[PDB]
Amino acid sequence: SDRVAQLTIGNSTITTQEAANIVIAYGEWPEYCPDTDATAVDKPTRPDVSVN
């Protein structure tokens, strides 16, 4: 029952059933840039739904 699925993000939804599971590249999830790593000082814009 790993084949059976449905991922939703934004106003879009995919339903996959002959899936081969899901790969998380290099075992890491995407994440907004943390303050320690950040360098540019202006406040970034994070549109969310309209882009993700």
């Binding site: 991922l7 996959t16 899936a19 081969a20 899901i22 790969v23 998380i24 590249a25 290099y26 890491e28 999830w29 995407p30 994440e31 840039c33 790593d37 950040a38 360098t39 540019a40 970034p44």
Partner: peptide, 14 residues
Amino acid sequence: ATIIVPYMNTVPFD
């Protein structure tokens, strides 16, 4: 097939 990809670079933004 489905693959989640995290940001990868030598810089935080580009």
